[PDB]
Symmetry: C2
Subunit: 383 residues, 2 copies
């Protein structure tokens, strides 16, 4: 019957195996094909290209090749520089660029052929601050990894002039093994209330150092910026009495979503897990649930545009895709219940600014839900 | 070659044209996204890319065919802090324009845990004409010392 091709560009270091993102992409396409409610008369196909991390030149070439083969959208690469380059190309040839990861939005940048499935920083920033205020903290130490961490917490950093929060800002070193000296200063400083802004792999690492340092006890409360908090091996810490609170956008309470995350673990967990990681093996991370959701949301849009077909476009020529403008518009209007909850983009900038978070905390039983957050309600804690 | 601001695609094309004419270096464009794209190209073809403006350095980025004549942020950050400490300020309000402002002052923002500076962080609005309400808060707040 009818057929439509998507492009995929996935970043990696060294060689195989496949990464979580490229895997979720493929997995979403195979699943949707078998669904008879979604794209009934339509069958999805794809080209996948692999590139080095941070080689925007290579990302450009591969994107141009794909636009030449003909594709209805490029689920372009993840990291800032390659992603900005594929986005500019996609904008010139009017093919939608689908992003899954946050990158810094420049105001005076006029690109309009992209949406981003990642929960925007502005909203996450607010939900961190909302949580802090609910715990009634007046003192807090924000610890971040790299520069862009600062930007994710700007709403929080600017609070000390409106509300009554004194706050200290510290930076992690490159390696978490180097983090004892920093933790010792916090300990002497009696900095019991701490927000860690950093990847979940950094967070697994910094917790081990915190245990070594006598800082996983009832005296300490840690808020985690990472959405992959639920991926942390928490077996070493749940008996200790520390408080760990963070957020989760992956909708694991829904039974339909749990069964999907499982089928994933079977084809994935089948491959390399690590012992000294401090992460659960075969948990579906957020980077990958978002890619899988992106392939669905875009498909909901394809259903509403049966006329559309792919064209072989050349980066040489300034001739855009006929159907681009209309397709991009359908994607931004789209609505979908996926692995990560309500998906809905912002009319204005195509950023995902409205979404639903579960709020999770460490109880002795493990990490469990204790409320919700959404930008219009603030917290809905269930005391 | 002249290009639009923020069109990294056009910057790529023009850089490729120039490498085709033949050039010993590209004094590539100023702004982050176009500059990163011309730098990646210059790195693949081993022609030096000469920059004049700061852009955020990613650690795990392996490009080596570029130098930047702009005074690095790390050093400027320190010199701001050095000056504040010479004026013996214990209170200071940092006012920044856009996100990347934060990064240029990180050395300063992390000082309140080592030295004795309490500090308040405020952001300007898009337009300075919109800035009276912000300045009124600083005035009521007795924020006399301001970066």
């Amino acid at each position: 019957t009818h057929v439509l091709r998507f492009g995929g560009i996935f970043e990696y270091v060294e060689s195989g195996p496949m990464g979580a993102e490229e895997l979720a992409f493929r997995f979403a396409v195979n699943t949707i094909n078998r669904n008879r409610t979604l794209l009934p008369n339509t069958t999805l196909t794809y080209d996948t290209q692999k590139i080095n991390l941070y080689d925007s030149f290579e990302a450009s070439k591969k994107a141009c090749d794909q636009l030449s083969l003909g594709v209805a959208a490029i689920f372009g690469p993840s990291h800032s520089s390659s992603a900005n380059a594929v986005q500019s190309i996609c904008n010139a040839l009017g093919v939608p660029h689908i992003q899954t990861r946050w990158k810094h939005q420049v105001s005076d940048n006029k690109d309009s052929f992209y949406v981003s499935l990642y929960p925007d920083f502005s909203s996450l920033s607010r939900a961190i601050l909302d949580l802090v205020q609910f715990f009634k903290w007046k003192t807090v130490t924000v610890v971040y990894d790299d520069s862009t961490g600062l930007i994710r917490l700007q709403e929080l950093i600017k609070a000390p002039s409106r509300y009554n929060l004194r706050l200290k800002i510290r930076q992690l070193p490159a390696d978490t093994k180097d983090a004892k000296p920093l933790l010792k200063e916090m300990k002497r400083g009696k900095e019991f209330h701490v927000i860690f802004d950093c990847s979940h792999e950094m967070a697994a690492g910094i917790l081990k150092q915190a245990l070594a340092m006598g800082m996983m006890t009832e005296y300490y409360h840690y808020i985690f910026t990472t959405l992959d908090l639920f991926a942390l091996d928490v077996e070493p810490y749940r008996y200790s009495g520390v408080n760990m609170t963070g957020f989760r956008i992956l909708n694991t309470e829904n039974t339909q979503v749990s069964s999907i995350i499982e089928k994933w673990s079977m084809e994935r967990l089948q491959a390399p897990p690590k012992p000294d990681s401090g992460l659960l093996d075969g948990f579906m991370t957020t980077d990958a649930a978002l890619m899988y959701d992106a392939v669905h949301v875009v498909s909901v849009a394809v259903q509403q545009f049966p006329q559309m077909t792919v064209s072989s476009l050349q980066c040489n020529r300034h001739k855009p895709w006929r159907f681009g403008t209309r397709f991009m518009s359908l994607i931004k209007e789209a609505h979908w219940e996926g692995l990560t909850g309500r998906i809905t983009f912002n009319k204005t900038n195509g950023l995902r600014t409205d979404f639903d978070l579960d709020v999770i905390s460490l109880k002795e039983e493990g990490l469990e839900k204790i409320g919700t957050w959404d930008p219009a309600s603030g917290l809905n804690m269930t005391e």
